[PDB]
Amino acid sequence: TNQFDYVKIGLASPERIRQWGERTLPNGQVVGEVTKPETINYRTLKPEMDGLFCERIFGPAKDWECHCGKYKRVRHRGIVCERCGVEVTESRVRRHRMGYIKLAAPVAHVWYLKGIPSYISILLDMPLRDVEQIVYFNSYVVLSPGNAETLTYKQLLSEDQWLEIEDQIYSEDSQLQGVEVGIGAEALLRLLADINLEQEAESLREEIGSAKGQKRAKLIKRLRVIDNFIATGSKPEWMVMTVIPVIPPDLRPMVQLDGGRFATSDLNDLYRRVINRNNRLARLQEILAPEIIVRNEKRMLQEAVDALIDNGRRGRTVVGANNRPLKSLSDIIEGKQGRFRQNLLGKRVDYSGRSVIVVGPKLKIHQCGLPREMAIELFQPFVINRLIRSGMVNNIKAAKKLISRNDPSVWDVLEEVIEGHPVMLNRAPTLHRLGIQAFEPILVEGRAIQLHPLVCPAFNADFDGDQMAVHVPLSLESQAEARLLMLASNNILSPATGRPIITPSQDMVLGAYYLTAENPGATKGAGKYFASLDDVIMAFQQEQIDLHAYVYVRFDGDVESDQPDTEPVKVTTNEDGSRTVLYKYRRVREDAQGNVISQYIYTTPGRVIYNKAIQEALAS
Amino acid sequence: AFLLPDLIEIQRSSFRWFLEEGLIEELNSFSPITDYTGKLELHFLGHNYKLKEPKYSVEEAKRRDSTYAVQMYVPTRLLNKETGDIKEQEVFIGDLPLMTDRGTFIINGAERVIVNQIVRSPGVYYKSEIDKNGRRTYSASLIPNRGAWLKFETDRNDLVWVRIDKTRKLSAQVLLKALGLSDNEIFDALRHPEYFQKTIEKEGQFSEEEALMELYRKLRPGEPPTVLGGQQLLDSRFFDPKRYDLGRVGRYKLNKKLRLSVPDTVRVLTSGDILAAVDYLINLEYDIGSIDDIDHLGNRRVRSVGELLQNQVRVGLNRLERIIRERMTVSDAEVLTPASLVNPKPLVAAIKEFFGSSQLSQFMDQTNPLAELTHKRRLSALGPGGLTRERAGFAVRDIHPSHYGRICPIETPEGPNAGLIGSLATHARVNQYGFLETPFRPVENGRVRFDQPAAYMTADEEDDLRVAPGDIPVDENGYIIGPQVPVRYRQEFSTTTPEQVDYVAVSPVQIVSVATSMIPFLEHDDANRALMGSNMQRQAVPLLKPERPLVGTGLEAQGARDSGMVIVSRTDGDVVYVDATEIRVRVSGQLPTASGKSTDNGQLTSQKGQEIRYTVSKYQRSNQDTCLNQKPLVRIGERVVAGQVLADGSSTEGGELALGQNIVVAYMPWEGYNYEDAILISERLVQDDIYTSIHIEKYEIEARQTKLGPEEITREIPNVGEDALRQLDEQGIIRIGAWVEAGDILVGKVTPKGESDQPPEEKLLRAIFGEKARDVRDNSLRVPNGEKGRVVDVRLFTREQGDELPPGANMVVRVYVAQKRKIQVGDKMAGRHGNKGIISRILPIEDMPYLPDGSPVDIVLNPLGVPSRMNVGQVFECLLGWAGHTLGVRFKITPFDEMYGEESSRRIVHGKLQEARDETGKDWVYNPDDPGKIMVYDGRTGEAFDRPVTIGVAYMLKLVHLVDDKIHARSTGPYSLVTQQPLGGKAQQGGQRFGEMEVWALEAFGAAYTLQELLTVKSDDMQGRNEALNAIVKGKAIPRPGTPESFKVLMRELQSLGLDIAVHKVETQADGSSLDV
Amino acid sequence: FERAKTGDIIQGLPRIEELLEARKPKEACILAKRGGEVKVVYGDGDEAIAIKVIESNGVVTDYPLGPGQNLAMPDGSVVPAGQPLSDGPSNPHEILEVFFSLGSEDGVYACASHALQKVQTFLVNEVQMVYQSQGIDIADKHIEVIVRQMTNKVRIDDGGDTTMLPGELVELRQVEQVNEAMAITGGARAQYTPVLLGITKASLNTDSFISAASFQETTRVLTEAAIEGKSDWLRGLKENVIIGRLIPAGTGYNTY
Known part of the structure; x- marks a missing residue:
């Protein structure tokens, strides 16, 4: 957290690239580079000494073990191997070193190139199939010098024309212009690197005021890049590149598989490829092969590189032993499964448990079933702790063992560890916050999760076989706020409404309906009378009345009846307080009698239950 | 009534076919090869696969885990056009898994079947269509069987272009490829060559430029073109039978489509065709004729092994060929034997593979017989040649009304695959072209004579005619009855009258398929629900003795029978000796085996005690670990005829299907348990051993030369005593038949661990005990947890024991462990009508509402039914059952109880009940008032209620995916490789993944530490993980986290891609900019 | 024979969907001015044809077409887009600039505003209505939240003053804030037509590039940002997550 504040996106200039793998040693002579595309040796399995897994430039896979040998222990740590130059530093030092390839030929970064705006082109003001030609060795360019004569700047000499440019040779008049025919990116390089640009965003901005109804979009664009570059320290030339970083090996891990077979990673594969191509090419210029090979060659290289970055981007998707497109650097961090979106916003934690689900009657809400099998593991440790607290268990392995023995404690301690200790349940991925809440883990036998009906709607569960998943919270603080604010009780109501x-x-x-309905013909205990105590109840168990049976009930409170009647009906004008007056429900005593001395409600004996049931649950 | 033809022959047939010929013909078509110079012929009498014979029992091959196969010789012929001389030989070339009893194959000892798929058929088609206004172009399109295509159209000129792939090409000369004079398509079309004439640019440039630049300046660009060029181009692309199959169909349609006249096997095309097309295209510019709809089942075709295979073989050859082409040819004239110039291999791959994988070598699955059938006669749309899920969307998943009768519409997975996977109607089957001839009935004067053995025509839905839906109130004796009989017709239903009608379906339940046309009272339900139904039915585990249900649709005995999971009177005979492992009514030699002497097969053991010794097999594992077995079933000394059935498969019973059982049910709202999607259960339920099944289990393990050594299998292992060095053999194996439990040892083996890397503290603790510790990890094999159960077997595999193991392994051991399982709370378990339900409580029997007769009922579902499920059908039969439950008599039935103005099914069932009273006068058997309602007390205390509750028996069924199949937990365990986050995959200590939407439930809540940490310490701060863990073990809280990994990873990548990430702080009053690891 | 877009089932998400991204495929010949005259039917017309609209306080005739799937009829006392004149979803954008054609007199703000809301509101309802189509309930309070989120970005014009390129669709404050600056320190007034950014345009390439990247353009926005160093303190949420540390709230809200 307090290690840094903001990140700094940007590019890796060949120094910075070569600054990803120097690992200069005290013999004093630098390394980090890899001079071999192959992987572990065939006889033994050790990592060559300059290939995709060279230790001495990534790190001793065998903790403190100079690939050479001599030292096989942390004791030998800061000290390294004379003979191998292995940097003895545990092994976690790998997965992070990086190394890199000096390139025998530049490669227009796929990304800047076949990009939506093809920034390269955006800055080159040269569309594809023209600048795209230039890489790919496929045309030529005049060069600033090359066109100092009849040639026109950025004119694609292609080859025939380029040869015609060699024709009309300097053995004749003029032809004193220069060279740098852009057959390869090597020249696109100094295109870029040619240009100054401080003039852009001002001298270029001369336009921008002008050409009112002109392209506009074009320009301003072209600005804002430029500007940007100049605003950052970005020289477009950095875009093409020249030397290549390389992933700390293990992430391209590669691995012995039990059956003996191995687990090659497309990473080292793309890579190694480009290695060859490279080397070889260096040997081609070394053997000064006639171009068109070497030409060809570069072309290739080029796109080996390429694919590495991004397969399938432009040329023909590489397809190796995987019998399918390989997996370029880009794409492992992209898509639905790019690193981002799935290991990174979505990782895949432990301290969990899934199961089928089932109604958990008897068990109230804010509780959950819990099988015994899973509940252990979820709670594993905590329990062992308690062991040691009770002292019954001494070491842990003690415990461990005992835990598997399911000693009384295993099903006795546990659940003391457990209550209080909320748990969170969830039915599959759930956007809704309420989708998952906090819950008290109560043990239970079979294997399901008991589950409360009232909460079902929230999670929206069947019980036709859904499943849920459990997690458990640790810090204690994290417990708190389970309780405190997800505890499935206290959230009654839709946050969306x-x-x-x-x-x-x-x-x-x-x-409840049926309880409280209104069966017609209700005769048993109909038109009867009652007075609190839940009397009528008793009568009910003695069936003095019928569950469905209108009957007067002394209750000084308020009805609501539905179908309001408020106004009287048929007051009984007789004597003291005897207006005494009816209502479609009520029946009451005011006037002399008082204000409401009488209060019999026309209600079925169910509804009274209900009302009661609330009632008491509610206050008291 | 009818006769169900064998309903899997589908693929019996195919194969035979192939076999019978289906490759000769290819083969010797591919027979003629010869030197690179016509001088040295390499042809063969490709007319006999002369195959020596399978080596193994099937059984074997299972045991040997080998691929039952055959192998296969071709006599060849007199070679060479230099001195014509034979050096004749024959050769086998490869092993052929020659099918199995279930009409499938087994290979590698496992068991698979080849689905058959469904595609469009070669031929030609037209699709026209509109612009944004109404400019209504057309198109056209061609498809060989194999080989490229040819596209046409009309682009707001009325003038046209011979596109090849999608829009690869586009030339005004749509029909000036290899034709002079022009009139051949200018007047021989006698219609509108380019609307009468000519393009605008009808330039006729095609003299020396003919077949030149056309295939160059706008083909295949970039070469000095060459009239040859262009030519040798096309002619490849359409003429070397080498690469262009029309397809018999190909013709066959064409001609039909265009009553071309080219029968001719003309396995590849002509010109006259082409133009013929083009016309048609034109003619309909002028609109004379029909675009085509590929959705029409007819113009779409399904194909099975026979060729799937076959052609795939063909390519086997070619590859082979080359090899030979040279190896045979180029070298001298002697050495070249007709022997060492051919090699299998490539074939042997291609098939070895094809089976070994495609998307079509699917595993079988034998959960239970009908899961087979329905998995053979499944057919599929996908597959290589097909589609993909994505690249094909929707309306290509629908019930093109031609499926009628041919594809059970009720039937489908879902997942995405809805629609992509259908199965086969019941009666359907296919013509050698591989369209589905549909059985019907010829109604004369609108009246079927019945006598007609059905009418096996209508391979396509366009019989075009009066066709009657096989549900007709039919007057006894033919005549239809209602003058308002519907009918489809031209894909329409249409009020029709009885006279002017042709065709009646054979039955009202043919379009449906297995598990669908079987629903007790289908007619009465939602579809889809019945969808679910079907499927459930396929997943019912089989039981110790699944009983034939009570009310069933008749249609099944068969189904069983053709499983081939039962054992069938091969022939004939009157049983004699039958112990529980075979029926020596067979190899014994008496009346069974001996009318297994009545008539006495071609090659087979024609009379004696014959290898009509059927065995019969007990408890073998299934593709679902389920067990199967067939007790003799038949008595002794008695009289059987072929096709009868001898012993019973897993879950079939009277020799007929029996998937689950039938128990008495009530419908009420039992509080909580059963409240909703929950089921109760008496205890007797599984107490009577009903609903318990078997399951058994593979467990193998293997030892393997570490370049440290071997690692082994001892009896001996360090650190043992009970459940270790106890239930262990001299090689640390188990004895057959040993209880085991959840941690005990299957088989013990150690490992050359040694050391060469240790912490001084370990050396200490020696010292103190000065234990010169041992050196050997000890990867015994332990039962994991939650298993039980006797051990059935073992299967050691080493140099001597078959040596079936990876290169360098020594022993392999299988071990098999079985397991009764009773029912128990937590099991999908459902009816035959999408009644997906889960057990919740089991009640000891003396608490359920029992019945008036005190007979405790025992399930109790929720009453309110036929809602979104619309499956009222199921009460109907409950009821019914109960009738035949009280009457104690089974009853078959059929969906669509029509020929009855009223529900019919409704006054049956009552009727039966009704009368069911009085045959026992029990009275409460039936109450017209409140039909089949009953009183009920309830066990707990002893009373009924105001509303009588229905009651029935009913047939339920329990479902594979069982609770244990989905249970998991992880305190912590193994992590990932690269990314260390616990290894969550289902078998092995996995972990619940918290995707974004899940986190969208956390940060959406209030205090979200959890979130945080959950994001890390229980998944990534590596050290974080640990030391937390610890930190609780200590007894206090946990320490503050750090940064997860996968960040750091991301750095890396990015960095590895032209970046300069400065994650970095800005500290000091001098605000300090740094960077970091 | 012409026939109906009847049935038994109508609009559903995708309806939503759309206007949430506020796609612009809704034919709407709504004029950029209120009028009030007769407009028999097509406009003037009624005889065979003339789909066409008002100039009441004006004199110009104007007259745009329309199809046989949508037919209009709102005569007299006509709409300052107090209705989308020509009656099929005017597209909040057309309506916004129309509410800007009518709304361009006040403070360019209040023109903006009163429009701006005007539409918003609009939008909201719209949505409800789908919900009520199903009866499904979603507190408008939410919707609000979004849509506000959806539109609070101007698109600069003649932005020689605020520097923002004339056409630099940008946030509402900063630019207007910079406007105030020049407004009190000399300078022009970059046009501020209030524009909606749909759903997807909103978010993604916005402030924090991490987010964006993760949301989408993992490699697309990546290039760029890379070209900009555009720093990203990941301050806020969605990163803290990406990243581990915790949240703007929590102790970050307690200690804070």
């Missing part, structure tokens, strides 16, 4: 979301939903409704 004040509406509640807990809601008794099916049958339980119709329980």
